[PDB]
Structures are given as C-alpha cells and as structure tokens.
C-alpha cells in the first residue's frame, strides 16, 4: 500500500524480533526493535549475576 | 483546482499482481472508471475487496 519507505520508520517490540538468527524476507530494512541483549551479555556473566 | 491525484492503467492480471499496488494508493476521492461492462464487473469487485 505504500507505508514503507525512507521517511517511514517502523518500531516494534521484542516479541516479533525474537530468534534474531531468522529474518523473514518481508521485513523491511530500518525496522527498529528493542530486545534483551544476547551479544555483549554473555552466558557466563548471566550465570554469575 | 482539479487536484488530479494520478492516472492508473490496468492492462491485465487485475487480481493476479502488478495491479493491487496501483489501486491501493488512491485515497478518499472520486474515481473516473473507463472500461467495458464485463471488465467493470471485475474492477468494481476488486475495488470492493
């Protein structure tokens, strides 16, 4: 319909961005999302905390 | 003023593809439709859809 473009910014929560290793082909670039950190927050730090 | 939004020419494949994107960009306005009766059948059916 035309709601995706340079001047449109889609903001979504962590519920749709789960399983970051899987990205559907219909997800436009620029899709800002927020999620719990899995890269910098290692499992060792998690267990220690 | 005659604020003409756009001109759409649906060659074929009205329900298949390449036509829904053009028909979806019309907002609340007046539509001048030029076709045949049997073609207008499908055109208005898809417009209602």
Swiss-Prot record, chain A:
Zn(2+) binds at residues 21, 37. Coiled coil: none annotated. It is found in: Cell projection, Dendritic spine; Cell membrane; Synapse; Postsynaptic cell membrane. Detected in brain cortex, olfactory bulb, hippocampus including the dentate gyrus, striatum, thalamus, superior colliculus, inferior colliculus, midbrain and cerebellum (at protein level). Detected in brain cortex, hypothalamus and cerebellum. Heterotetramer. Forms heterotetrameric channels composed of two GluN1/zeta subunits (GRIN1), and two identical GluN2/epsilon subunits (GRIN2A, GRIN2B, GRIN2C or GRIN2D) or GluN3 subunits (GRIN3A or GRIN3B) (in vitro). Can also form heterotetrameric channels that contain at least two GluN1 subunits and at least two different GluN2 subunits (or a combination of one GluN2 and one GluN3 subunits) (in vitro). In vivo, the subunit composition may depend on the expression levels of the different subunits. Found in a complex with GRIN1, GRIN3A and PPP2CB. Found in a complex with GRIN1 and GRIN3B. Component of N-methyl-D-aspartate (NMDA) receptors (NMDARs) that function as heterotetrameric, ligand-gated cation channels with high calcium permeability and voltage-dependent block by Mg(2+). NMDARs participate in synaptic plasticity for learning and memory formation by contributing to the slow phase of excitatory postsynaptic current, long-term synaptic potentiation, and learning. Contains an N-terminal domain, a ligand-binding domain and a transmembrane domain. Agonist binding to the extracellular ligand-binding domains triggers channel gating. A hydrophobic region that gives rise to the prediction of a transmembrane span does not cross the membrane, but is part of a discontinuously helical region that dips into the membrane and is probably part of the pore and of the selectivity filter. Belongs to the glutamate-gated ion channel (TC 1.A.10.1) family. NR2A/GRIN2A subfamily. This is Glutamate receptor ionotropic, NMDA 2A. The lineage of its organism: Eukaryota, Metazoa, Chordata, Craniata, Vertebrata. The chain holds residues 246 to 294 of 1464 of the full protein.
